[PDB]
Design a binder for these strands. Structure first.
Ligand SMILES: Nc1ncnc2c1ncn2[C@@H]1O[C@H](COP(=O)(O)OP(=O)(O)OP(=O)(O)O)[C@@H](O)[C@H]1O
Ligand SMILES: O=c1ccn([C@@H]2O[C@H](COP(=O)(O)OP(=O)(O)OP(=O)(O)O)[C@@H](O)[C@H]2O)c(=O)[nH]1
Ligand SMILES: [Mg+2]
Ligand SMILES: [Mg+2]
Lengths: 501, 1208
RNA sequence: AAAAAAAAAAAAAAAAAAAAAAAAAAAAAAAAAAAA
RNA sequence: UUUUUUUUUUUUUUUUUUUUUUUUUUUUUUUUUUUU
RNA sequence: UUUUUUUUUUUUUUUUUU
């Protein structure tokens, strides 16, 4: 007895790769589960949506030890109807409750099942990477089982003992399903259709998997391809499933491409992005602003310019984008001018990569004051000396946030945000959570995550590197993961799901 | 025409000629505006300019009335005072004036085109100037000013004193008042457009200054300095100047307390009792004296020169401690206004709620165990202030993990969710999917959960709550800024419920919190009074300026780590929509992904800490919608009180452990914390305690807090209560008799006089002269809240006027023959203030037949039926005990006019502001909502109760739905629905039902005599035996431990005779409290008790099921059985006196303590309950007549009817 | 959109103290009180 | 010795409402209503 | 050879305080 009724809702389990055996006691059990779902949906909707006595329904369904028979009375009629319907099954033990461990599965569970969870030990099925495992008892009995065809395993079904009504087929041979279907006697069987690809990359610490929301025909890679080739579609759509620090880097080749299920975005990330879009479209709000944090090296500007272009073309209004280090590159030039230019185009003109930052110069002096110039000199130091140097850098990060003065940072973001020629919807990146009291006032702020090992990418920059790595360490030591964690495909999907005009 | 020539004004005794005179003149004031304008602005007042006399300590002071130019001749409206940004989204960032700048009234013109930004701004400034200044607690502001002026006149018997000249020079602009307030269109309509804009607030300012005069804080001379200082502060912006120099005009007392050198103070014990007095030096230590230079230069450069010369007068001319106490009280009354501080939300939103960053930053702890979304599960600090706090709280994790397990948290959620509050606003589809009446009463937090209770176990609602914003809500408070607190809906509160429950548990394990121990009397400051008496002590009163604006995200992570550790050691399944299961998880060091069994609450705390948004949102009528900057604390959550307490005690105790581990001692003994306010106490040498104080200050600056660090040898401040060397210095200038935060009419005048009594009772042990306060309260009950309107049916106008004018004066108005339902405004007599179910105010002496007067009732007098004793006191009670009568002498009572008050108090005219709250609320719908609401926590408790209630219905007699635990939530939602439909009518509805009962009761109307008022009639006779005093009367002679307990004062003498309070000397409780009332905190007039005792009179076979219908536990079951058994035996006598605990602040609570002062004959003891009853009699009389005794023993007589009532 | 009309109206969390619980009448009985 | 009212107390029963604006009435958001 | 204890219901309004 599953949470979501498979006889009613077949397509959702078809998406997971689970097909129904055609028409034994399992068939009777699954039909009795369908009748129990229908009866519960009748009784619960007759009230506001709450069951009358949820532990009684839970015990009658799960345990089968309770028989309610009345020979007020009107308050128990809903229980007596359920009691006759359970008595007329004659099971030796009651039906169990089955839940998958996936978020997309739990968002579709009806409310009465959620009420019945709290008074019943469910049978929770864990998932590997979003797909429920197939060695479990209930799935092996009810649904038909997959079969994996590879470049070695490929043969006729008569070489095995495969049957149509018990075995389903999943290929990853790279050949087309029509070719394998009409060339190998696989016409009678049924195939699993997946849409994502799961790529295991070679990294320094070991092999690294990667889940990609695109398809294998779209994301055109083959076995032995570089990491920089098709880097941007991977950045837009990929997610590393391993523990940080993962070892993905610019030297990474691949090992195998396997089809896999798509990913589903979280509820909280779509909620925060939808609240931002509600702030964009409304005329009650004057200034709309998003704040996006990332570790120094995650590659956020090359995505957020594309995000701004998507939002601009989809909403029609002009989105202005402030960079991550606009304040440092502005303070490098105007630390001595009494009254500087707070205009928007003058700030965005000084935003290129040739313009050095103020914090990078001060951290370079802080590194050279301890005789550190190389990465091999910095990594060789112990942790406590690094913490000492990071506190010496915190003593100069604190000096620009403490008060609202004409060279401060809170005044800078005030005068840029509330200008006359500034765009309406703005997007501002940050570096640490203390800067949120300084960056202009919002309702939404997120923390972005990409497919990058940030300490690995800073080892490979052609210029500097040591100051970049030291500032990365200071910034990672300054911000925790205390806001919502938002991947790039979540933002692109949140743009797509919002209806316009 | 003149109150100061009356015979009440010089004898202060209600004779028969005086009482009618005062009643007539107060009627003259309360009726029409013409008598008020002639009273306040008579031409007989000689306008004075120079005035000389004593200060608070008899030193001669000379002053001069001086009004600046900017109040009489205001500047024109400068539009640059409230500027805007260039995108015009908000005000200017750095702007000076958050409040009402003084300018000419008619200069504020809106000439712009409508639906434009400048038009919106000038309309909002108009709304600021007219609406946001009227804060009148009782009635019209001119009538409150008249009440204060009249109290001053009848007290001092003369009209020439400076405040009348201040009134005639500020407010006398022509023949009419410059402004009036209107209840219909709620604003202050000006009539002279050339008057200054701030000038309506000076009505309340003059009321507070006169309240300080009648209070005895400052004399007539110091009122000149106070009003000059206040008029100086309103030169540019009246509120900003008071907020700027608030700290500098109060932080001077430590220097004068140093300059008196040596004082003789009493010494307290551990166990709340005075031992003796000693003479300690009062010199501050060497490091404190380095601050006096900076404070002296700062008060020289910011302050006003008259106030500065007064502050230097107070420094130079003090000799004892009490000179400093009196001068501190005077400077409190000179610097505080008492008015609430209010403007538009958008102005004070920057300085109220904007997050700021101070000295150091706070860093992150390393993440040991991590969710698949990289949300942190288990984490730990390496080194820092988080390490310092967790090094103390990691000991406490393990016991709290055991305590959290034994709490069923869904029922705990419901019992917390009991509070009615808005939360969320509905959308349109639910208003059609749910009844429109349900959408009407959907303004409550319990009803909102009852509506959406079908998705309580669904995890999607938590992700759904993040889309909704957090609506801001403003608050006022006197002498502080407009604090803008946040207000959030159900699910934002639900995420912060488990951190509240986890951090709640720390109070049982560790004593250092002032939250669990509050009582309203001297048991609250036993700690401060004990520790200030000790030697080699260092008292540090550390405050954090800007508590919520300092707590950033990283500072909140310290509390997060403690909650996560306790939750990871906890084991609870099924908290909310969450449930215990196995989760894929990441760990540090491991490269792959592990699998651990995460329980429910730790999932809940992880999702709370991971998705933390603070930024509030106010929808302005000026700018559209204003967003707040992120990084504040939300401060509307459930855990908004325990967060600060746990954080601060973790920092302080961890600093103690760190100093111990670094080879240094810890001089700290005991601390108390409520949150923003911390008491610290050190003991040892000067060097060690100064080191430990500076180390705690340094660790607070390491945690990023701007700290206010006042520390001394002989002063402590916590909970707005200040103590200097075993002596409570109250703050009388903090609370205000003349302003309320919200404007509310009086629909029921008992609630007005109860508010008046509760406000006066807080001003007893913090005032210097309570007698003038009693007289001021009498006059603001006299003329301010006296007029009560009426609207009769037009046919029966003259009949009702011919009936009700025998007992009252009915101000007859013109009939309208054109339109029906005419009105007849009446005024109710002054005897109403002295009656139970009436005003309940203490009484002045009345004249009997003999000429002998009654006892002048003090401020410690009881309330309740002991106020009904006053009728028998007006009758000659010793003559009543003489010839064995019980006749009340209705001639004298009708002559004083009490029987009209009793007629009005019985016919319940004042009780009928709405007269009904009807049915057709569809209780089927309420029963369905509370059916779907029971299904959340503890299933099975209430169905049993309904079956027991049906059993008691079917065989015997029914119970009320009020009484049944199963019908409790039905009754809760029903009573929440009754408050959503509220109405207060401006007039009355005396239409033939009220008229028939008035015609029936307008008879001779003798006052009824309940046969149980025979306990009221008894008297005491003065012997010539002077009794001994308590020995602590000698020790509190030098420095009085309160303002009003000075040597020779009646509070001191009552404290001498009755003695101090104690919790262990409770000889009679079960015999005292029942004839007081309730048995064991269950009342006798409790429907629990009443229905149970009606069961107990009948057969007791229905009794166990009665308990099952209530569902009370077995211990309370045995208590209730004892209650019926003890009520059935000698439940005859009960006396019902109400005695406030704040009113009885240092005095004794146990009435047995007055048994050694009254000699009782042994032939009177005829029952098992006489010994408590007689002690109640003697205790109430010794507190009642404390202004008339001179220390002599009493004898008691009793009436034979009382003996027959007690016997029976 | 120019105009007219019924309704839904905005005030969080913790610690502590004090007060409050429809009306009218009929049937049985005692005290107070008027008449005889 | 009979009757008029208050109150300690028992039983039964009715169980239940109106508009009047003294007001110098406020603003925008939405469902519906009629002219243009 | 017997005699004594300190305690959590709800609704609304007010007060002190964070
Ligand atoms: N100087 C004044 N000038 C003009 N109108 C005034 C003035 N003072 C009060 N009022 C207004 O005149 C109205 C007359 O009210 P009215 O005399 O009918 O009953 P009221 O309630 O006794 O008046 P009040 O507001 O003084 O209590 C007041 O409601 C108020 O609106
Ligand atoms: O009604 C309230 C008031 C206050 N609080 C909470 O208690 C704290 C109030 O603490 P205080 O009132 O003692 O000082 P303050 O912070 O308000 O004023 P400044 O020190 O900034 O000068 C605040 O931090 C608030 O979170 C509430 O939760 N509710
Ligand atoms: Mg404080
Ligand atoms: Mg504070």
């Amino acid at each position: 007895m599953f949470a979501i009724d498979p006889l009613k809702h077949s397509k959702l389990y078809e998406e997971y790769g689970l097909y129904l055996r055609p028409h034994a006691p399992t068939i009777r059990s699954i039909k009795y589960a369908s009748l129990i779902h229908s009866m519960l949906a009748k009784h619960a909707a007759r009230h506001n949506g709450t069951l009358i006595n949820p532990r009684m329904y839970a015990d009658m369904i799960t345990l089968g030890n309770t028989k309610v028979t009345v020979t007020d009375i009107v308050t128990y009629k809903a229980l007596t109807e359920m009691s006759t319907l359970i008595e007329s099954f004659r099971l030796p033990s009651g039906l169990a409750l089955i839940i998958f461990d996936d978020e997309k599965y739990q968002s579709l569970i009806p409310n009465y099942i959620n009420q019945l969870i709290a008074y019943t030990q469910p049978h929770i099925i864990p998932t590997w990477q979003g797909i429920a495992d197939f060695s479990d008892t209930y799935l092996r009995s009810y649904f038909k089982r997959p079969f994996e065809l590879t470049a070695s395993n490929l043969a006729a079904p008569q070489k095995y003992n495969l049957s149509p009504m018990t075995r389903s087929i999943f290929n990853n041979t790279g050949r087309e399903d029509a070719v394998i279907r009409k060339l190998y006697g696989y016409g009678e069987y049924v195939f699993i259709r997946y849409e994502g690809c799961l790529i295991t990359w070679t990294g320094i610490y070991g092999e690294v998997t990667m889940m990609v929301n695109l398809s294998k025909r779209d994301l055109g890679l083959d076995v032995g391809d570089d990491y920089l080739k098709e880097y941007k579609k991977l950045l837009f759509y990929g997610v590393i499933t391993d523990a940080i620090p993962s070892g993905i880097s610019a030297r990474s080749t691949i090992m195998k491409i396997s089809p896999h299920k798509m990913m589903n975005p979280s509820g909280g990330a779509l909620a925060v992005l939808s609240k931002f879009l509600e702030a964009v479209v409304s005329t009650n709000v004057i200034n709309a602003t998003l704040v996006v944090y990332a570790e120094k090296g995650a590659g956020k500007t090359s995505f957020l310019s594309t995000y701004a272009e998507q939002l601009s073309l989809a909403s029609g209004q002009v989105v202005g984008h402030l960079s991550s280090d606009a304040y440092g590159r502005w303070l490098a030039k105007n630390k001595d001018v009494e009254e500087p230019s707070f205009a928007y185009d003058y700030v965005l003109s000084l935003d290129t990569d040739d313009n050095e930052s103020y914090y990078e110069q001060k951290a370079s002096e802080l590194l050279i004051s301890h005789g550190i110039s190389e990465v091999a000199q910095y990594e060789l130091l112990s942790v406590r000396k690094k913490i000492k140097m990071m506190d010496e850098m915190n003593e100069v990060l604190i000096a620009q946030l403490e008060n609202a003065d004409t060279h401060s940072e809170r005044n800078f973001y005030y005068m840029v945000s509330t200008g006359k020629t500034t765009p309406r919807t703005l997007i501002v990146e940050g570096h640490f959570n203390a800067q949120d009291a300084t960056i202009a006032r919002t309702d939404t702020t997120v923390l972005l995550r990409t497919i990058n090992d940030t300490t690995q990418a800073m080892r490979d920059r052609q210029r500097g590197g040591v100051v970049q790595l030291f500032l990365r360490d200071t910034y990672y030591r300054l911000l925790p993961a205390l806001h919502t964690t938002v991947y790039p495909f979540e933002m692109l999907e949140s743009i797509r799901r919002w209806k316009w005009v | 025409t003149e109150l100061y020539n009356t015979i009440f004004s010089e004898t202060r005794k209600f004779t028969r000629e005086s009482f009618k005179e005062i009643e007539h003149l107060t009627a003259k004031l309360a009726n029409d505006r013409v008598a008020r304008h002639d009273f306040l602005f008579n031409n007989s007042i000689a306008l004075i300019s120079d005035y000389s006399g004593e200060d608070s300590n008899g030193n001669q002071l000379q002053a001069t009335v001086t009004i600046p130019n900017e109040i009489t001749n205001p500047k024109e409206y400068d539009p640059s005072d409230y500027p805007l940004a260039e995108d015009e989204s908000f005000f200017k960032q750095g702007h000076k004036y958050d409040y009402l700048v003084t300018f000419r009234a008619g200069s504020l013109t809106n000439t712009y085109e409508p639906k434009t930004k400048m038009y919106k701004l000038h309309a909002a400034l108009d709304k600021l100037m007219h609406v946001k200044q009227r804060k009148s607690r009782f009635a019209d502001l001119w009538r409150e000013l008249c009440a204060v002026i009249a109290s001053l006149d009848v007290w001092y018997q003369t009209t020439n004193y400076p405040l009348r000249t201040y009134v005639k020079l500020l407010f006398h602009k022509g023949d009419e008042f410059p402004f009036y307030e209107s209840p219909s269109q709620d604003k202050i309509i000006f009539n002279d457009k050339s008057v200054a804009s701030i000038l309506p607030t000076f009505v309340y300012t003059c009321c507070q200054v006169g309240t300080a005069i009648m209070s005895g804080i400052l004399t007539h001379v110091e009122s000149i300095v106070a009003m000059n200082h206040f008029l100086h502060c309103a030169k540019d912006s009246y509120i900003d100047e008071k907020l700027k120099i608030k700290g500098i005009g109060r932080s001077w007392y430590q220097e004068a307390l140093h300059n008196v050198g040596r004082a003789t103070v009493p010494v307290w014990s551990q166990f709340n009792e005075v031992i003796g007095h000693r003479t300690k030096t009062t010199s501050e230590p060497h490091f404190v004296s380095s601050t006096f230079i900076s404070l002296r230069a700062k008060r020289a450069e910011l302050l006003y020169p008259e106030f500065n010369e007064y502050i230097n007068r107070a420094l130079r001319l003090s000799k004892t401690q009490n000179d400093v106490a009196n001068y501190y009280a005077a400077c409190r009354a000179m610097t505080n206004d008492g008015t609430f501080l209010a403007t538009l939300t958008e102005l004070s939103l920057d300085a109220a709620v904007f997050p700021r960053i101070e000295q150091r930053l706070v860093t992150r702890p390393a993440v040991l165990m991590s969710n698949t979304r990289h949300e942190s599960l288990k984490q730990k600090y390496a080194n820092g202030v988080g390490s310092i706090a967790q090094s103390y709280l990691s000991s406490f994790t393990d016991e709290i993990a055991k305590r959290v397990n034994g709490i069923h948290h869904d029922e705990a959620w419901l019992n917390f969710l009991t509070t009615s509050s808005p939360g969320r606003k509905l959308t349109e589809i639910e208003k059609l999917e749910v009844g429109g009446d349900v959408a009407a009463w959907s303004n409550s937090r319990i009803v909102m959960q009852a509506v959406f209770a079908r998705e309580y176990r669904t995890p999607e609602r938590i992700f759904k709550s993040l889309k909704a914003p957090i609506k801001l809500v403003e608050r006022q408070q006197s002498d502080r800024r407009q604090r803008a607190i946040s207000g959030l809906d159900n699910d934002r509160l639900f995420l912060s419920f488990m951190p509240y429950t986890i951090g709640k548990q720390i109070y049982d394990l560790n004593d250092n919190a002032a939250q669990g121990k509050q009582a309203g009397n001297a048991f609250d400051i036993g700690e401060m009074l004990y520790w200030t008496s000790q030697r080699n002590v260092l008292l540090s009163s550390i405050d954090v300026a800007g508590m919520d604006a300092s707590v950033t995200t990283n500072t909140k992570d310290i509390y997060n780590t403690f909650v996560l550790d306790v939750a990871s050691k906890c084991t609870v399944p099924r908290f909310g929509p969450y449930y215990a299961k196995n989760m894929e998880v990441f760990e540090v060091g491991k490269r792959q992904s592990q699998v651990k069994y995460v329980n429910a609450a730790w999932q809940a705390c992880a999702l709370e800490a991971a998705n933390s948004q603070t930024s509030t949102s106010y929808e302005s009528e000026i700018f559209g919608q204003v967003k707040n900057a992120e990084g504040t604390y939300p401060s509307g959550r459930a855990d908004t009180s325990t967060h600060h307490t746990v954080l601060l005690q973790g920092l302080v105790r961890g600093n103690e452990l760190k100093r111990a581990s670094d080879g240094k001692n810890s001089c700290l003994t005991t601390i108390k914390i409520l949150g923003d306010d911390i008491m610290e106490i050190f003991q040892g040498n000067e060097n060690d305690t100064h080191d430990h104080a500076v180390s705690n200050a340094s660790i607070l600056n390491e945690s990023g807090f701007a700290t206010t660090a006042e520390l001394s040898q002989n002063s402590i401040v916590l909970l707005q209560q200040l103590v200097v060397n075993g002596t409570f210095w109250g703050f009388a200038d903090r609370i205000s008799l003349w302003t309320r935060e919200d404007t509310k009419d009086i629909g029921r005048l008992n609630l007005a006089m109860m508010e008046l009594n509760a406000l006066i009772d807080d001003l007893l042990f913090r005032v210097r002269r309570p007698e003038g306060l009693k007289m001021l309260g009498f006059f603001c009950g006299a003329i301010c809240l006296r007029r009560f309107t009426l609207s009769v049916d037009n046919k029966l106008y003259d009949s009702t006027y011919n009936n009700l004018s025998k007992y009252m004066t009915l101000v007859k108005y013109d009939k309208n023959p054109d339109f029906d339902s005419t009105l007849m405004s009446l005024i109710l007599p002054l005897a109403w203030l002295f009656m139970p179910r009436g005003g309940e105010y203490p009484a002045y002496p009345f004249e009997r037949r003999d000429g002998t007067f009654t006892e002048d009732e003090s401020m410690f007098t009881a309330r309740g039926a002991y106020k009904r004793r006053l009728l028998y006191d007006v009758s000659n009670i010793r003559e009543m005990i003489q010839q064995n009568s019980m006749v009340l002498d209705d001639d004298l009572l009708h002559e004083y006019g009490f029987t009209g008050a009793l007629l009005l108090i019985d016919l319940n005219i004042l009780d009928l502001i709405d007269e009904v709250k009807k049915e057709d609320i569809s209780p089927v719908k309420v029963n369905e909502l509370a059916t779907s609401l029971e299904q959340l926590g503890k299933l099975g408790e209430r169905e049993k109760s309904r079956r027991a209630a049906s059993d008691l219905k079917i065989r015997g007699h029914a119970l009320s739905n009020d009484i049944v635990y199963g019908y409790g939530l039905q009754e809760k939602i029903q009573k929440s629905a009754m408050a959503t439909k509220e109405t207060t009518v401006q007039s009355k509805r005396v239409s033939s039902r009220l008229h028939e009962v008035i015609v029936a009761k307008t008879r001779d109307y003798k006052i009824p005599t309940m046969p149980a008022d025979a306990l009221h009639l008894y008297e005491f006779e003065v012997e010539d035996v002077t009794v001994d005093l308590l020995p602590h009367a000698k020790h509190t002679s030098y420095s009085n431990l309160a303002y009003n307990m000075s040597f020779g004062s009646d509070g001191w003498f009552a404290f001498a005779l009755l003695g101090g309070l104690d919790r262990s000397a409770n000889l009679l409780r079960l015999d005292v409290a029942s004839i007081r009332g309730n048995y064991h905190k269950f009342s006798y007039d409790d429907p629990v008790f009443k229905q149970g005792y009606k069961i107990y009179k009948s057969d007791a076979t229905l009794l166990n099921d009665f308990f099952v219908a209530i569902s009370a536990g077995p211990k309370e079951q045995g208590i209730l059985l004892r209650a019926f058994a003890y009520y059935s035996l000698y439940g005859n006598v009960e006396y019902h006196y109400v005695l406030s605990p704040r009113q009885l602040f240092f005095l004794s609570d146990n009435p047995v303590s007055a048994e050694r002062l009254v000699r009782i004959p042994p032939s009177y003891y005829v029952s098992t309950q006489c010994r408590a009853l007689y002690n109640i009699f003697s205790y109430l009389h010794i507190l009642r007549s404390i202004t008339s005794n001179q220390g002599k023993r009493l004898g008691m007589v009793l009436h034979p009817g009382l003996i027959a009532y007690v016997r029976g």
